[PDB]
Design a protein around this ligand. Structure first.
Ligand SMILES: C[N+](C)(C)CCCC(=O)O
Ligand SMILES: C[N+](C)(C)CCCC(=O)O
Ligand SMILES: O=C(O)CNC(=O)C(=O)O
Ligand SMILES: O=C(O)CNC(=O)C(=O)O
Ligand SMILES: [Zn+2]
Ligand SMILES: [Zn+2]
Ligand SMILES: [Zn+2]
Ligand SMILES: [Zn+2]
Lengths: 386, 386
């Protein structure tokens, strides 16, 4: 391509930059120290690992290019200490330091596209066995999970072991104190409100951990007619609405560290404590995670007395917005359904149902880490586009 | 105790606060909304789970106490809607909203005590089998790990499976793409610079993950005489020195997102990308994690061209400080040694050694999550103090 073909390469600015003029007349700049740091030769770079061997200690941060020649596809550089490097035009083009080039590459790496939703949600749905068997379907599954925050998979069995298959399709599941997988049913001496017939208001799972599960998988084995409907909301959409409608409540919830706790016995004995801001912003002010489960919020609340009541007032505004008919999407799982969802972004809940002498309702759940999921998504995209 | 015995309890400030006068004449204040939110009765609180059943939707954020009576050990409160609550004096005392009381409780929950060190480090050392067998020893192990950032365990076997035993003693290990455990030895077509005979400069493990491993365990099975010494530094101590000596370099490294990558095949096939600030600060400006492995830092660098060279200049200052003779502690692992260390705080490295026709050097490593470790520490403290 004219865009990836070198018309001219030159050392500039005390030889501390290389400038490429592409055949399309666009220009790109590459710092000499970055080129040296990223020399792909066998001394500097371990090809079997696609990893840098060069040490920081080896890198002269004031380095300039000693000499440069080029052809249409490569640049060949000598360094002051006689080290010698070759860089490929396409590799350079991809890594161009312009804002537009860097942003393009970041989109390709991290799939940021996000579709916010409320009660109008058309629940994305795919077949379970299709997703296990076919990369095209597994790609649609994970890409949709990332973009929309939820996908329903239909046609699974009505037996345990289905979420474990999805785990393997991803890579591996995320072990917690509740096990590799866990059974959501009414239990005697329940160690968690989940394991009762009570209503679960909107929550994220596991804010008692400093790194809550990124992705949740929930498979319906048995459903009851007496209640137990599912509800979901898009936390990122709700947070946007809250910031606009009640900036005071938004500021409180995005700045106040709330203590979470979980003590008991399951996979092993545990005594877990964390602190999170309910609305967790990145350094640019964008909401990246919601951390909220009313069951596991501690009785311990580590704020001055005068900030307590305003916190609760803020929290109520947030919960009320989540409950609003424009925000929430309600549905009922049937046996063989699996929902797979972003546990950092969505909040989820369930309606109460009636206890009985045997088990009338049984879900199997598991977690996965977003890095594990994104890894699989990157691989699938390449396989499906190749 | 006079300190935990109630002399007077009273509703104040439109009945929106409860004030306790203790028998020691100290006074404590408890917001009415917090008391209501934390009612311990069976409607509001699931005792088997030690979790809140009360929903935010149930909580009137403007609530005041309707009536209150007390004795030396308890307060008995009626609410406007006729709900009724009992709170224990000791439970109240622990949760007092004063800065001193809250800070005390936070220290008890999170064990913040930290002892910084340099080359003068006296490496804490305990016996392996003692730590497996005895809670007193396992408590010393984890408390020291937290405070100092490293403990050496001696007298393990020279066979794989030792770190897995420590994993079970903690609770469970943290699975990654390199496996439940992994073998540090020279490998053909190595998928990681670790699996070669090369020098590893100071690094943290796994900044390619958004949640790097909190704790690392490394067991020496076979050691070589040709090199392979270990080196460690206290990253929190180095960061303090860097901030003082070079505040510009500190600001760059604590604000610049660096891209990390890992692509290959091990436990399964993986294509991993992350972004981290090398020096990661909490919201109060305290360093909480270092994220740095020069091998896995990407060729992709997502900053404007003019910020590139100053970044490298900053990075070199940081690495030079880590290498300084006052900062680093050097030692050589023998067969049967295990080091267990804080992978968020320490950086570690190894000297190069000579390749040969069979394996002359073999470590087995594994990871654990700090929340898993802290859970065990809390439990052990209670067992050993009880
Ligand atoms: C379903 N379960 C018990 C694994 C987790 C529930 C939520 C959390 O406890 O924060
Ligand atoms: C030892 N190993 C391969 C599990 C991890 C090394 C470090 C990292 O790759 O960041
Ligand atoms: O039971 C349901 O439908 C949903 N369960 C949960 O959200 C849980 O166990 O945390
Ligand atoms: O081999 C050693 O002594 C240390 N190894 C590592 O730090 C690693 O594999 O990341
Ligand atoms: Zn080179
Ligand atoms: Zn849940
Ligand atoms: Zn109550
Ligand atoms: Zn390492």
């Amino acid at each position: 391509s004219m865009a990836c073909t070198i018309q001219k390469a030159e050392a500039l600015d005390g030889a501390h930059l290389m400038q490429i003029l592409w055949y399309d007349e666009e220009e790109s700049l590459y710092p000499a120290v970055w080129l040296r740091d990223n020399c792909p030769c066998s001394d500097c770079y371990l090809d079997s690992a696609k990893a840098r061997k060069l040490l920081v200690e080896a890198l002269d941060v004031n380095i300039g290019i000693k000499g440069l020649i080029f052809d249409r596809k490569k640049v060949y550089i000598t360094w002051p200490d006689e080290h010698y490097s070759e860089f490929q035009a396409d590799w350079l083009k991809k890594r161009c330091f312009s804002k537009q080039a860097r942003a393009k590459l970041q989109r390709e790496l991290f799939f940021p596209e996000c579709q916010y939703w409320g009660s109008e949600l058309q629940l994305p749905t795919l077949d379970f066995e299709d997703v296990l068997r076919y990369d095209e379907h597994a790609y649609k599954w994970l890409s949709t999970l990332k973009k929309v925050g939820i996908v329903r998979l239909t046609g699974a069995s009505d037996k345990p072991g289905e979420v474990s298959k999805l785990g393997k399709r991803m890579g591996f599941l995320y072990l917690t104190f509740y096990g590799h997988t866990w059974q959501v049913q009414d239990k005697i001496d329940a160690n968690n409100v989940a394991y009762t017939t009570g209503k679960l208001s909107f929550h994220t799972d596991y804010p008692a951990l400093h790194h809550p599960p990124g992705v949740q998988l929930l498979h319906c084995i048995k459903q009851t007619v007496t209640g137990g409907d599912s509800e979901i909301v898009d936390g990122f959409n709700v947070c946007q609405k809250l910031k606009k409608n009640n900036p005071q409540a938004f500021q409180i919830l995005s700045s106040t560290f709330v203590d979470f706790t979980d003590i008991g016995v399951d996979y092993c004995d545990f005594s877990v404590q964390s602190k999170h801001k309910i609305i967790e912003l990145d350094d640019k002010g964008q909401v990246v995670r919601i951390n909220f489960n009313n069951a596991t919020r501690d009785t311990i609340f580590d704020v001055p007395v005068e900030r307590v009541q305003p916190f609760y007032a803020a929290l109520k505004e947030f919960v009320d917005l989540m409950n609003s008919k424009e925000s929430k999407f309600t549905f009922k799982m049937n046996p063989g359904d699996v929902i797979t969802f972003d546990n950092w972004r969505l909040l989820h809940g369930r309606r109460s149902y009636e206890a009985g002498t045997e088990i009338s309702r049984h879900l199997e759940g598991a977690y996965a880490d977003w890095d594990v999921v994104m890894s699989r998504l990157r691989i699938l995209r390449q396989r499906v586009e190749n």
